[PDB]
Ligand binder design. Structure first.
Ligand code: TRP
Ligand code: TRP
Lengths: 528, 528
């Protein structure tokens, strides 16, 4: 028919489902009846979720929820960066960084944007100096103030509350989902129904007419949102939309995870997520309050589930026979089309990639934002659907490419896994970026180096999600550098001379913040 | 292999001297630049219209104040392009015909449509227009400019304060002269007045040297072709094919002149006029005490004599005595703007009728990209390929936008107008139209802050033709969405509170109309 969408049914009630319910409930408030169908699942351990800055500005701010309100109810901690440990040295899976060129084998991928100097990213000046032997300091320590304060577990905020850097959050997803469930049902009028989908009825146009549950209830709506996770109950099962496996770019498809109690008083809390390289994958460490979530993401192609359990438990000194563990098999890739007919997939039902760069939750609300932007009426204009699908496919594929580069450019050749990664091919779009990088060009340089604008305007960030800063942190961090300095620098003697103070400013902030900032633990004590 | 040491620019018109200035400034003291230009019959100052970033991206880069160059170039101000008679049948006249109770004209002003609850004002306007809530045209409802332009107001108060975004009108010859003085006197650019007779290339196909009529031989590491439509280096020497694009643009000729004007009796129009004709359109570019004008037409629909006649008749000029410039130009772009060690800048690179004042912009936009992708003597292929991609998109998007001005005109009164409707829009442009009809914005700006936009070239270049521009032209011509944006039916609070936004515009139109001095008034002061 025609007329606006009157009823929406969300199938699936986890993080994605209740985020969808909250975002749509907020966006269409009072002009659409929303029902979320939810069936009980086997409970799992809170193994932790890491996020990015726009979670607050693009999601919680949109809902009208203050950082302090949701943080306290979700027992959240702070994330200032992802610390990559042992990606450049051979060896077993260990929590301790090995030695590399006189220092621990780690590098940071921090938030924020590299400063521009005479229209050129600081990255280019750093490399120019490194290349000409004027420096041996790593890219991250030279261009970011964060590495130094993170090495000392400092808080991203002073005791008086003032923030000194861009940061995100670490939390148990289950708590956020419960928080949102209460918010959506209590504040936004979303209807929660506890039932299991038994049958999906489609019409002759291939659209979903209704969903019938195991109790015999029939739920019809104008638009259906699939938040059923890997099963893709609607988008794949009912709509039969093909899923594109991308194991030709990503070898990791499994994980063994758990949660470990932690004495924050004795050891403090790390203001960062750790990405610890393993023999057949990598392990995440996500610090929360009084405990940390950790999971070994690996490739079933190079390690059996039991070998992964052993490697994982031994690294944390846990009993492989008694430790509570979540054994997961991921569905890596994306649907050929995220939205088909009147069925929009949101969450893992849509796409999934290992949490190497904290994009899981981002993918959920980035998509919800794109859905509302391309919101249809009952005629389901195909142009809205196609453009939405294009945005989603690009969002995922760029991430897929970026993550693959973490493994493709690691210098490690010590296990079949690391060696195999180098035998895969990068997508053409990614290879073009590397060609540009090697030629000394910036990759997706931000329009402005103003981080407040970037993280404060979703449209601005979504169009430049993976920017030059991100690419340099990871590529240079791993050891991939340009074949030679940007040739235009040889024509800018005054700029390459005055940049001295730009590097000096970072050094002063590194020193000042290190001497004045409280530890993350200290701040959390006062705060929570 | 060493930096670029010598640069030879062939051609000394507007493009050539802008190249010498920009490059002389950008590479100051690190490259020797010589501009080689032949002396030949100058043309009439038929006038050139520009856009806001001419100052922020070009003159500001050179370190030249707006006051300094515009007074030495006797320039006037441009606040918009006024399209006249594009919707009504008839002969080519300077007077707007009547349409729906008013004159047949619409404005394409500078600046950005304001965002209301994350949605461009254009969408709220159409929603109301579509629901019979209003009959006011898009431009008058969403822009303050239209009514002050109708009264020939100045973009700045007598005290100098700026009340709107504006650009300039000037005789290009004067600007070229100014830049020649600047580059030679202040940037050390060597000027040689001679004619190229022979271009010698090496075994790699790169240019080795150029020999002149007097027997002089000039060598360089990089050659900039600013020879105009001849493409002496890029097309003739390097043999790079020029790609004609008359399958999108029928206009390929023009008859132009300069007409004396009594500013005291008539004031000065703060806008460029684009007057629809029987087989093309005519530009009117107001300057000091005169205006440049030219009939752009299609040689396949009107003869040179017919064009001269139609043109002279509208301005009441005598065909037999009025000095006239008759030109037949090539429309399109080179397959590649930069090949080997030869970079084309200006009309030697590409050209499209001046319907949206992009001619000069194309020059410094390309110069900006050349410096960003500046090579050393090894001429890294990647830098060249990327530069070329930037140029082709810059041009093709403009080509598409201009074609739409003709394709969507409602006129069917002459072979020309009817023939435009039988051409094919490029796939990319068709997708944009599909989106537009679906109620979607086309290239919405990341922010509605015009200052960020016009103050940051990277920002504008990535979003050069934005939703504001498409709505001005498409809606102006009468092409509107099939229905309102489906989103608005879900935002009652937004659609209610938007009247305050429309009201704010109304107050601005009122106050400015009442308080602003006429353009002529301001011009007397700022100039005389
Ligand atoms: N645009 C994202 C990029 C990003 C994703 N994951 C990250 C992890 C660490 C640092 C940056 C990122 C941001 O700046 O937030
Ligand atoms: N980004 C350009 C768009 C543009 C080109 N030519 C124009 C003519 C009129 C109005 C806008 C334009 C600007 O706003 O300057």
């Amino acid at each position: 028919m025609s007329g606006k969408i009157d009823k929406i049914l969300i199938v699936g009630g986890g993080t994605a489902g209740w985020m969808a319910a909250s975002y749509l409930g907020k966006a269409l408030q009072g002009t659409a009846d929303i029902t979320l169908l939810q069936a009980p699942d086997i409970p799992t351990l809170g193994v932790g979720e890491a996020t990015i800055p726009n979670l607050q500005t693009a999601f919680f701010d949109f809902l009208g929820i203050p950082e302090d309100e949701w943080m306290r109810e979700c027992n959240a901690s702070y994330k200032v960066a992802i610390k990559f440990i042992n990606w450049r040295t051979a060896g077993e899976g260990t929590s301790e960084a090995r030695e590399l060129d006189g220092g621990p084998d780690h590098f940071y991928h921090s938030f924020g944007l590299l400063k521009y100097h005479e229209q050129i990213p600081l990255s280019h000046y750093w490399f120019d100096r490194s290349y000409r032997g004027k420096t041996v300091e790593p890219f991250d320590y030279a261009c970011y103030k964060e590495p130094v304060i993170l090495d000392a577990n400092r808080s991203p905020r002073r005791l008086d509350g003032s923030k000194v850097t861009n940061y995100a959050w670490h939390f148990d997803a289950h708590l956020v989902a419960d928080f949102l469930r209460r918010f959506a049902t209590e504040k936004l009028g979303v209807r929660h129904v506890e039932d299991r989908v038994e049958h999906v009825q489609r019409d002759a146009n291939g659209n979903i007419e209704s969903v019938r549950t195991a109790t015999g209830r029939v739920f019809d709506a104008d638009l259906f949102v699939d938040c059923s996770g890997f099963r893709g109950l609607l988008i794949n099962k009912a709509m039969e939309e093909p899923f594109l496996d991308m194991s030709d770019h990503l070898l990791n498809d499994s994980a063994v995870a758990t949660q470990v109690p932690h004495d924050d008083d004795a050891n403090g809390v790390e203001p960062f997520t750790s990405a610890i390289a393993m023999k057949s994958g990598w392990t995440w460490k996500i610090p929360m309050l009084g405990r940390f979530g950790t999971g070994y993401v690996y490739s079933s192609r190079f390690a059996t589930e039991d070998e992964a359990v052993r490697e994982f438990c031994e690294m944390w000194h846990l009993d492989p026979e008694t430790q509570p563990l979540n054994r997961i098999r991921f569905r890596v890739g994306r649907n050929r089309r995220a939205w088909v007919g009147n069925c929009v997939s949101i969450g893992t039902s849509s796409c999934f990639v290992e949490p190497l760069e904290s994009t899981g939750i981002y993918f959920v609300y980035a998509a919800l934002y794109q859905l509302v932007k391309h919101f249809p009426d009952k005629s389901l204009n195909p142009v809205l659907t196609a453009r939405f699908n294009r945005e989603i496919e690009t969002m995922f594929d760029d991430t897929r490419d970026f993550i693959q580069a973490h493994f493709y450019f690691s210098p490690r050749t010590d296990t079949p896994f690391w060696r195999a990664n180098k035998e895969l091919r990068l997508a053409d779009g990614m290879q073009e970026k590397i060609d540009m990088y090697r030629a000394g060009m910036a990759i997706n340089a931000p329009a402005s180096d103003d981080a407040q604008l970037y993280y404060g305007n979703f449209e601005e960030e979504f169009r430049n999600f993976w920017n030059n800063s991100n690419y340099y942190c990871v590529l240079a961090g791993l050891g991939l550098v340009p074949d030679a300095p940007s040739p235009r620098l040889a024509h800018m003697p005054q700029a390459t001379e005055s940049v001295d103070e730009v590097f000096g400013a970072v050094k002063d902030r590194q020193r000042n913040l290190l001497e004045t900032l409280p530890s993350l633990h200290e701040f959390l004590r006062q705060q929570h």
